[PDB]
Ligand SMILES: O=C(O)c1ccccn1
């Protein structure tokens with residue numbers, strides 16, 4: 001997250017870190033057994049880490065639980081990142097508490113201009129690299145679909161939206177992939193892709209979770 005702030009320990013209690021020997025992507029806890037992340041975060045051997053603030057220090061509220069199964073969206077396209085969503089099942093249910101909590105799925109899509117909270121452990125530099133070990137947060141509005149498509153012609157589908165600031169300075173970045181975009185208490189986005197970080201006229205692009213709620217519900221009920 002570039003241009004954000006230190007969230008505070010466990011202030012985003014649905015935020016997960018996906019670990020394969022190291023943090024590589026975020027995700028969002030949607031019930032005690034299931035996490036939503038980006039399909040472009042798929043790999044075998046995922047451990048889900050819940051209750052994290054500093055990802056390099058055991059602070060006492062963590063739960064580390066191996067994934068039993070991953071389900072990439074059936075229409076995921078790794079070239080275009082269309083349908084950039086995946087479900088991860090925990091081998092054992094998480095113990096839900098104030099620091100390890102689920103986020104609700106949308107009942108409807110969010111409007112342009114709605115303010116959202118984006119979070120992650122990604123790079124905090126727009127020019128260079130520095131990784132925070134504690135969770136970063138960013139308040140950012142959903143941008144109009146027209147501003148989004150203007151920035152990325154022929155690359156935006158109905159399954160994507162842009163959020164952030166066209167003037168630059170504030171954005172998601174490397175290591176934020178898969179993490180949450182929460183708006184009005186609902187998981188509306190997944191950190192998906194962009195061009196650079198926090199550059200002018202190159203906002204972040206996010207998977208439009210509201211399009212996938214039926215798929216999520218049906219998939220988790222059958223797995
Ligand atoms: O460089 C990355 O890994 C990146 C950038 C933007 C969004 C997600 N990931």
Ligand SMILES: O=C(O)c1ccccn1
Pocket residue numbers: 024025040041174175176177192193
């Ligand atoms: O392509 C990306 O954005 C990416 C891939 C792997 C881990 C984090 N991000």
Ligand SMILES: [Ca+2]
Pocket residue numbers: 052053054055056057058059062
């Ligand atoms: Ca920790």
Ligand SMILES: [V+3]
Pocket residue numbers: 173174175176177
């Ligand atoms: V990434």
